[PDB]
Enzyme design. Structure first.
Site, PDB file in Angstrom:
ATOM      1  N   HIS A  41      12.254   5.741   0.014  1.00 17.99           N
ATOM      2  CA  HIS A  41      11.915   6.109   1.246  1.00 17.99           C
ATOM      3  C   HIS A  41      12.674   5.395   2.263  1.00 17.99           C
ATOM      4  O   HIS A  41      13.222   4.526   2.135  1.00 17.99           O
ATOM      5  CB  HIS A  41      10.213   6.164   1.508  1.00 17.99           C
ATOM      6  CG  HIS A  41       9.730   4.821   1.810  1.00 17.99           C
ATOM      7  ND1 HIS A  41       9.970   3.563   1.284  1.00 17.99           N
ATOM      8  CD2 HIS A  41       9.121   4.483   2.984  1.00 17.99           C
ATOM      9  CE1 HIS A  41       9.415   2.601   1.692  1.00 17.99           C
ATOM     10  NE2 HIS A  41       8.730   3.053   2.751  1.00 17.99           N
ATOM     11  N   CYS A  95      10.917  -0.979   6.290  1.00 17.99           N
ATOM     12  CA  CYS A  95      10.050  -1.497   5.019  1.00 17.99           C
ATOM     13  C   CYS A  95      10.933  -2.350   4.257  1.00 17.99           C
ATOM     14  O   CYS A  95      12.280  -2.467   4.253  1.00 17.99           O
ATOM     15  CB  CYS A  95       9.975  -0.293   4.091  1.00 17.99           C
ATOM     16  SG  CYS A  95       9.030  -0.719   2.586  1.00 17.99           S
ATOM     17  N   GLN A 113      -0.634   5.220  -0.345  1.00 17.76           N
ATOM     18  CA  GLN A 113      -1.314   6.012   0.951  1.00 17.76           C
ATOM     19  C   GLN A 113      -1.215   7.416   0.755  1.00 17.76           C
ATOM     20  O   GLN A 113      -0.222   7.991   0.133  1.00 17.76           O
ATOM     21  CB  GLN A 113      -0.836   5.521   2.214  1.00 17.76           C
ATOM     22  CG  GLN A 113      -1.038   4.161   2.544  1.00 17.76           C
ATOM     23  CD  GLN A 113      -0.292   3.545   3.985  1.00 17.76           C
ATOM     24  OE1 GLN A 113      -0.938   2.881   4.735  1.00 17.76           O
ATOM     25  NE2 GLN A 113       0.888   4.192   4.306  1.00 17.76           N
ATOM     26  N   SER A 136       1.126   3.677   7.873  1.00 18.39           N
ATOM     27  CA  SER A 136       2.333   2.650   7.794  1.00 18.39           C
ATOM     28  C   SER A 136       3.460   3.091   8.996  1.00 18.39           C
ATOM     29  O   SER A 136       4.010   2.164   9.689  1.00 18.39           O
ATOM     30  CB  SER A 136       3.072   2.723   6.666  1.00 18.39           C
ATOM     31  OG  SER A 136       2.422   2.375   5.628  1.00 18.39           O
ATOM     32  N   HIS A 139       7.559   8.392   7.386  1.00 21.78           N
ATOM     33  CA  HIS A 139       8.434   8.422   6.275  1.00 21.78           C
ATOM     34  C   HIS A 139       9.524   9.430   5.924  1.00 21.78           C
ATOM     35  O   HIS A 139       9.010  10.836   6.413  1.00 21.78           O
ATOM     36  CB  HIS A 139       7.892   8.086   5.021  1.00 21.78           C
ATOM     37  CG  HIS A 139       6.605   7.027   5.075  1.00 21.78           C
ATOM     38  ND1 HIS A 139       6.811   5.953   4.363  1.00 21.78           N
ATOM     39  CD2 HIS A 139       5.492   7.236   5.524  1.00 21.78           C
ATOM     40  CE1 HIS A 139       5.765   5.179   4.658  1.00 21.78           C
ATOM     41  NE2 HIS A 139       5.013   6.039   5.204  1.00 21.78           N
TER      42      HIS A 139
END
Lengths: 145, 5
Positions: A41, A95, A113, A136, A139
């Protein structure tokens, strides 16, 4: 059609296309479950992210709207072939998986998630998501296995 | 840890 896929109508051109409401993927072409999947991702965080900080910048201040614009731009460059997903993830993902070209390794349901899990399992091997929203951030997900 | 539940 496969899970999540629906037929839609291009507003600018009038041609039929296909949209997936789970992965947010869209494409002209008519679309072509596993116990585990492997995904990479690219994450763009924003000011409402649960942790507005990353290796890229200590205090992430961009708005959700700005994050979405960045995601859309990366998708465009990936789809045009101007840039590779892996290269963009290494450079721009908020990330730590950026250091592994975005690779997260293999995972089963009940680990990620939820929007991220659902998108990952609705992709076929090799397919890429559209913008996927989680706590988060936003993505782009690529299913590799 | 990042997008992990």
């Amino acid at each position: 059609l496969p899970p999540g896929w629906e037929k839609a109508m291009s507003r600018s051109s009038g041609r039929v296309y296909y949209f997936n409401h789970i992965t947010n993927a869209s494409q002209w072409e008519r679309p072509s479950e596993p116990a585990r999947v492997r995904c990479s991702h690219l994450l763009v965080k924003h000011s409402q992210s649960r942790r507005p900080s990353s290796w890229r910048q200590e205090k992430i201040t961009r708005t959700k709207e700005e994050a979405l614009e960045l995601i859309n731009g990366y998708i465009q460059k990936i789809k045009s072939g101007e840039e590779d997903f892996e290269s963009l993830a290494s450079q721009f993902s908020d990330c730590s998986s950026a250091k592994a070209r975005g690779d997260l390794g293999a995972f089963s349901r009940g680990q990620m998630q939820k929007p991220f899990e659902d998108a990952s399992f609705a992709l076929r091997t090799g397919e890429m998501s559209g913008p996927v929203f989680t706590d988060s951030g936003i993505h782009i997900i690529l299913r590799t296995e | 840890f990042x997008x992990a539940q």
